[PDB]
């Protein structure tokens, strides 16, 4: 993970929908889960951690319990995709991902949530 990229700097999602934000990182030959770290956060609130091949939710903020998950199948393709269900107005803001795979990098992602109707 010398350089982490994001497909979008801004995501516009509808209220109540399911949101998937992504951070891409280089995977040359095949994914070694032993050395991979994936960390998602938003406004000092930890969303999810992925280390040693497992999700770590010890410091997960209570807002994202049962709502946030990491698409593990996408990790093999160099995609750290954060999936958040039942998006509410409080989910708009500034997100950040950290990927550590050999190297490490950070990327900022902005989320805007449209009004329900």
């Amino acid at each position: 993970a010398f350089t982490v990229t994001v497909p979008k700097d801004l995501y516009v999602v509808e209220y109540g929908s399911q949101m998937t934000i992504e951070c891409k990182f280089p995977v040359e030959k095949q994914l070694d889960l032993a050395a991979l770290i994936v960390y998602w956060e938003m406004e000092d609130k930890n969303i999810i951690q992925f280390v040693h091949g497992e999700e770590d939710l010890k410091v997960q903020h209570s807002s994202y319990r049962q709502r946030a998950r990491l698409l593990k199948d996408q990790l093999s393709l160099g995609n750290a995709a954060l999936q958040i269900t039942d998006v509410k107005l409080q989910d708009a803001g500034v997100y950040r991902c950290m990927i550590s795979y050999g190297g490490a990098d950070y990327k900022r992602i902005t989320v805007k949530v449209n009004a329900p109707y």
Partner: antibody
Framework: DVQLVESGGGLVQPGGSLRLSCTVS????????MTWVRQAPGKGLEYIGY???????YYADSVKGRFTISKDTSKNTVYLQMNSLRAEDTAVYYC????????????WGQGTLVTVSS | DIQMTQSPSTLSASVGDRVTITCQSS????????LSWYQQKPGKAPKLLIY???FLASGVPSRFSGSGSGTEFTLTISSLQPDDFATYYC??????????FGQGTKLEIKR
């Protein structure tokens, strides 16, 4: 490539004020935290404070009420404004990418020397 | 309020030896794993060796190894090389965006 450069160190009288600058190259200041660390002559590393990627600031207890950290993204610079300097503040001052426990704190500046003395 | 103690304060070894540095924290590090190790040589800025208790930074030789959880942590250097003689610092991250450094361990050349 990525570069860190401190500047602004020099001689200050006790009770004086001094502002240090950390000019970055190849670091997205909207995506990276930046930390200030000092080292007194012959002593160990001491965390001072850091400013997050969303411009929130945190300080060690030893500089609370005296040091303030700010960021100017349009100038690629992170600042350390030091007030009410004491002789104990004499140290080399480093700015480091990321936080002291961060995965990307492998890049440090060369440090700038601050001397507080009468 | 938060203190981190390194032991031993000084190490003496030869090239090819194995040494261990112990880092003890009064408070649990954040998520029980936010402990980093640094290497510093005189006149130079610190160098990041390990983060998240066991993850080597880019270019760090595999002979460096970290372990521990909570409040007790260990850095192990197997088969010392001449480049390894330096001063070593652990650093902890804590809830509420708090940080501290250990007092440092000096690894000198035994003769």
């Amino acid at each position: 490539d990525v570069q860190l450069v401190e500047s602004g160190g020099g001689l200050v009288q006790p009770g004086g004020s001094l502002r240090l600058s950390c000019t970055v190259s190849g670091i997205d200041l909207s995506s990276y935290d930046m930390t200030w660390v000092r080292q007194a002559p012959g002593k160990g590393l001491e965390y001072i404070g850091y400013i997050s990627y969303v411009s929130r600031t945190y300080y060690a207890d030893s500089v609370k009420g005296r040091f303030t950290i700010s960021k100017d993204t349009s100038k690629n610079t992170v600042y350390l404004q030091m007030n009410s300097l004491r002789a104990e503040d004499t140290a080399v001052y480093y700015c480091a990418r990321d936080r002291p426990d961060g995965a990307a704190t492998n890049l440090w500046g060369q440090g700038t020397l601050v001397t507080v003395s009468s | 309020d938060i203190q981190m103690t390194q032991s031993p304060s000084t190490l003496s070894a030869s090239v090819g030896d194995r040494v261990t540095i112990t880092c003890q924290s009064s408070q649990n590090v954040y998520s029980n794993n936010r402990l980093s190790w640094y290497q510093q040589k005189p006149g130079k800025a610190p160098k990041l060796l390990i983060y998240w208790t066991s993850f080597l930074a880019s270019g760090v030789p595999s002979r460096f190894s970290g372990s521990g959880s909570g409040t007790e942590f260990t850095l192990t250097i197997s088969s010392l090389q001449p480049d390894d003689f330096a001063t070593y610092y652990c650093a902890g991250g804590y809830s509420g965006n708090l940080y501290t450094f250990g007092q440092g361990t000096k690894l000198e050349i035994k003769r």
